[PDB]
Ligand binder design. Structure first.
Ligand SMILES: CC(C)(C)c1ccccc1OCC(=O)Nc1ccc(O)cc1
Ligand SMILES: CC(C)(C)c1ccccc1OCC(=O)Nc1ccc(O)cc1
Lengths: 463, 464
């Protein structure tokens, strides 16, 4: 199974010998240091339940870690005594307190999102031990934040080229299962995406949400039948029409997506879809459109040339603001080379050519869930308050060659002014008083406050 | 973990899209045509952890059926096809996977492994497990990128010192905090350990021990080290007391002490170079003090650190004409190091005549996170199908991108008479004009038939 004593950076194993004498408390916090001006806080509850809560220390896990580290360091520097103390005194529960803003809250950059401190003075070293596991919440935060920014771009352009926001939550579809680094990442990232949208093909995201968050809806995300290259090319290069015909007929009463660029996307749209199989498309209902999927070439140019061909083979209308609109049984999804930058280029290029955003949805894979780093939001975990010799000092780092790697001081609290802006109070000044938005979510091995996925989606809504 | 829930959603509907009477779906993985050769590593982890043994149960089938009912707002899940696997093969996957030995260094554009169904009723299963198998792009890319950095380090360590001693400890993995999940950390750190032995990502140690095994006591090593929180906890006026306490607590092993908490150029010239000078020269060369700057421009900072340190400690010229610190004193640059910044630093030290013996490097998110599937163009494609007794060679050929063209027919990898590699298509490998097929069966009907030790993988991935 998973062993928390082997779930930290190696140098942190030796930290219990590096503090000043008689150190009783280490206090640390997470923030997205100072374009992404506001971030969605999401993912901590998953980490608390899966890795931190309950009996996480056992006699076998202590023996396992001791053997590994003895060889790893070529020396005895494992704190077997202190880990036995946790096992004996607390039945293997972590004497730790965590306070956090509610999940789904949208918070401007440079504010405390959660804090970590030891509740037993013998475990002063435990705060920075679990930094490694906790700081990985940068990923769901960054995915949920970058996904929400793409929802602003879509909502803005879907509103000027159409006048409404119908189907907005299905306009950016998670295709990223293949392009992420692991099954666990797929689950975490896909659930972070579902904070803002409801279309996904990464099934692991559905499983994570039901197990760790829960929803009133029958399922957190939805998809539609779709073809890949292997289901088309299997019919033979001369039988692409047959492959198309078999697939739209199998799924004639539900939406179906057909990748149409196996050999020539423009021929498939002009000759195959626009003539040979046109009778099978114009007969489809509004609730069961065909979605044509280009998957190669330049993303914007191919989208423009595909829409041009479909426009001169199917009845185009002009909507309430002067933008062109395919018939309700035909749609397009661009799911190749889509990230937040290219997505902006596609929708602007379409608006420039007077096409409505209603005609198109987007699929993002490695760009939505993989090509993201801790430096995008400058997610940072710092120690700000220690107590040595019964004397608490506000600690901080302040490099001379980089003032941007600075950190806050002392005990922190997150507050909201009467005007509404957010402010992080340092040096314990939060005791002088609204009130603190950091609620306790973990204490001494138990999760003390939970949020459902519906509550998270409500907090992360746009204005 | 539920294999029936571990695939792209639309793959649930593909058993109804293949041509009728399709009895075989045959698919292959390649890194489609810097990064001219790839290290093949990571498939066995996926096989052992997710694919082998009884992976289909009545519980997992019911769980998947109810999920997909609501996910698609319709019943399309192939519950009969999954029941057949549970009933006939006791939940063992009827799949055969042939792959090149892990650790092999293969040029781009070659078949790395192939997947086919062994039961005609399970034609749909081959590309069902595409999603889980294609994620091997990540360990492949990390191992390849790590090894390309090893070439750079080896080329310059030889020009400046004459040997390659300690090469496998010159690029240290600090990526645990910067990646996206615990599993990703383990996978990524093990790929680094294919070429090096130094890591702080403990999850990689456990992943290797559980899924590959080694004859060594531990797959990776590290040393005690201080972070900013253990230095600042003494207060700004007591940075000296922290340094002396830590160096004394770890005098028989190497120790790394971060020095840019307050003022790094004050850290080397003043506190190390004078106040605690007497505690640094007095340590063995097997247990030196490692100075770590972690801010500022990487190349400029390390250069100004080496020069300041020379003004305070005896620097000798090595047999090649390059400056070399006393062996009780080393430097590690682990801030913002990737394959690009590494090259300009090492020659930036060589053109400024500093020996690469002095320096080690650490890499975090640049080593394990800022990597995507299209860096090596890792792709999984169907190349051969059998329909109504007729074998057919299959491929894609998009008009706007000839680079996305896929191979045709049954594939094989061969050693050429000149000692290189070539991939044969359309079954021509059966002629064996060159060698035997280099693809060995590693998975068949739920069993791992060929397993590799991590010691074998490291041997296959060595330089030269
Ligand atoms: C038709 C639905 C999804 C209800 C819809 C409703 C409102 C607005 C847009 C919509 O379609 C977006 C789309 O194209 N999704 C899609 C999903 C998977 C896939 O493989 C191809 C495409
Ligand atoms: C035995 C050692 C000292 C690893 C060694 C042996 C041979 C050659 C070079 C070496 O040092 C590389 C290094 O700096 N490793 C390092 C590890 C962790 C850390 O936090 C800081 C640094």
């Amino acid at each position: 199974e998973f062993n928390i004593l082997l779930a930290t950076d190696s140098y942190k194993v030796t930290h219990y010998k590096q503090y000043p004498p008689n150190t009783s408390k280490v206090y640390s916090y997470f923030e997205c240091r100072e374009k992404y001006e506001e971030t969605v806080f999401y993912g901590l509850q998953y980490i608390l339940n899966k890795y931190l809560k309950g009996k996480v220390v056992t006699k076998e896990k202590i023996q396992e870690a001791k053997d590994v580290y003895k060889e790893h360091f070529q020396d005895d520097v494992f704190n077997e005594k202190g880990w036995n103390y946790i096992l004996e005194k607390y039945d293997g529960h972590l004497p730790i307190e965590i306070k956090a803003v509610p999940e789904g809250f949208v918070i401007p950059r440079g504010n405390v999102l959660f804090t970590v401190e030891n509740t037993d003075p013998e475990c002063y070293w435990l705060t920075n031990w679990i930094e490694t596991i906790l700081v990985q919440s940068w990923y769901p935060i960054t995915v949920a934040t970058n996904s929400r920014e793409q929802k602003k771009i879509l909502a803005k352009y879907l509103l000027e080229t159409s006048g409404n926001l119908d189907g907005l939550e299905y306009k950016l579809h998670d295709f990223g299962y293949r392009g992420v680094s692991s099954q666990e990442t797929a689950g975490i990232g896909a659930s972070a995406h579902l904070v803002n949208f409801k279309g996904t093909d990464t099934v692991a995201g559905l499983a994570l949400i039901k197990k760790y968050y829960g929803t009133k809806d029958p399922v957190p995300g939805y998809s539609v039948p779709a073809a890949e290259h292997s289901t088309i090319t299997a019919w033979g290069k001369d039988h692409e029409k047959d492959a198309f015909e078999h697939i739209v007929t199998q799924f004639s009463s539900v939406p179906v997506s057909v990748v149409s660029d196996s050999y020539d996307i423009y021929n498939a749209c002009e000759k195959i879809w626009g003539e040979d199989l046109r009778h099978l498309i114009v007969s489809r209902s509004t609730q069961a459109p065909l979605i044509i999927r280009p998957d190669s070439g330049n993303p914007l140019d191919t989208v423009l040339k595909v829409l041009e061909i479909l426009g001169k083979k199917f009845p185009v209308t002009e909507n309430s603001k002067g933008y062109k609109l395919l018939p309700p049984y035909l749609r397009v999804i661009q799911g190749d080379g889509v990230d937040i930058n290219t997505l902006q280029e596609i929708v602007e290029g379409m608006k420039q050519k007077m096409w409505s955003i209603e005609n198109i949805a987007f699929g993002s894979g490695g760009g939505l869930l993989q090509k993201l780093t801790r430096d995008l939001l400058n997610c940072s975990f710092k120690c700000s308050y220690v107590v040595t010799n019964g004397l608490g000092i506000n600690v901080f780092k302040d490099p001379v060659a980089d003032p941007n790697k600075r950190s806050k001081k002392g005990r922190l609290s997150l507050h909201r002014t009467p005007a509404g802006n957010f402010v992080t109070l340092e040096e314990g000044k939060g005791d002088l008083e609204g009130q603190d938005l950091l609620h306790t979510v973990f204490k001494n091995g138990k999760v003390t406050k939970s949020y459902s996925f519906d509550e998270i989606r409500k907090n992360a809504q746009l204005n």
